[PDB]
Design a protein around this ligand. Structure first.
Ligand code: R5D
Length: 290
């Protein structure tokens, strides 16, 4: 319900961008004095079509209904008269994404597992509200402080229809295929368990400290090759069905690699849920923290 008056919004810097949107850092100063608040403002590009505009209004509604310590805080909206929609105003998460932060800050295994646990808490909460994320990756996990992480973007999140166990996708060029389970790539169905697969890929990112040369697109494209025409996804699907997986990251314990592999079960029903992961991660964290 909170309305931001565009007259007090001063742009500081870009925070991220996608195909049909951009997130920017703004100082919202209704004075000019030191009572200024820093906010993350997400805007839909003016040239976006009806499918993206309807999806935008759904995204804004999704963030309004979500309130959890490991989910970015919705702050309000303001009229985006330039794009003729609304701008989603959220809290500014100061340390940015783990994708940006990890290659520059060598973080201990213990803090990595704490983040892993926190992502699961935020995800079990999202699944309890009957939503699927569809874009769980380290670029979407924001660092507030060294002991606090938040899921910071919901651009692809969808409500799971009432008497159904999955959502039917309709794959696009923006689909994060390298974080996707076989059932998403093949049958065009996204289950709650499909997010658990993406969590396994996010856990692999964290354990590689988000090193570009070890990234899921880099590692999978080395396995598929580049002279494959329109067949990257088909080749990805068949390597996954042969049981090929991203490798064990350097210094990753065998137990945590096994947990990653368990999130990556080909059969979606064999994967743990986010509720199952929480006491497991709690326990593996206490272990390493000690
Ligand atoms: N459309 C579209 C766009 C692609 C979608 C996008 O940018 N989504 C996001 C997850 C990114 C970052 N972001 C946010 N980032 C922050 N903090 C922050 C500080 N430094 N940095 C840059 C190093 O990461 C980011 N606080 C809130 C956010 F909301 C939201």
């Amino acid at each position: 319900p909170t309305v931001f008056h565009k007259r007090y919004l001063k742009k500081i810097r870009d925070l991220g961008e996608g195909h049909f949107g951009k997130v920017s850092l703004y100082c919202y100063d209704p004075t000019n004095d030191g009572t200024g608040e820093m906010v993350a403002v997400k805007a839909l590009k003016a040239d976006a079509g009806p499918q993206h505009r309807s999806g935008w209004k759904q995204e804004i509604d999704i963030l309004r209904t979500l309130y959890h310590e490991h989910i970015i805080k919705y702050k309000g909206c303001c009229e985006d008269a330039g794009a003729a929609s609304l701008q989603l105003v959220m809290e500014y998460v100061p340390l940015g994404s783990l994708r940006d932060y990890l290659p520059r800050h060598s973080i201990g295994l213990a803090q990595l597992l704490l983040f892993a646990q926190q992502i699961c808490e935020g995800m079990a909460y999202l699944h309890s509200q009957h939503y699927i994320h569809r874009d769980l990756a380290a670029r979407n996990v924001l660092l507030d402080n060294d002991r606090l992480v938040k899921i910071g973007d919901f651009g692809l999140a969808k409500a799971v229809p009432e008497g159904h166990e999955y959502y039917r996708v309709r794959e696009d060029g923006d689909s994060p295929v390298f974080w996707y389970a076989p059932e998403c790539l093949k049958e065009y169905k996204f289950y709650y368990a499909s997010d658990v697969w993406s969590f396994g890929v996010t856990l692999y990112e964290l354990l590689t400290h988000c090193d570009s040369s070890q990234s899921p697109p880099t590692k999978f494209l080395e396995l598929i090759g580049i002279a494959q025409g329109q067949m990257t996804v088909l080749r990805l699907t068949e390597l996954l069905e042969r049981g090929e997986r991203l490798p064990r990251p350097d210094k990753c314990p065998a137990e945590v690699y096994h947990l990653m592999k368990n999130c990556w079960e080909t059969e979606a029903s064999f994967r743990p849920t986010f509720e199952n992961l929480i006491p497991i991660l709690k326990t593996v964290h206490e272990k390493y923290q000690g």
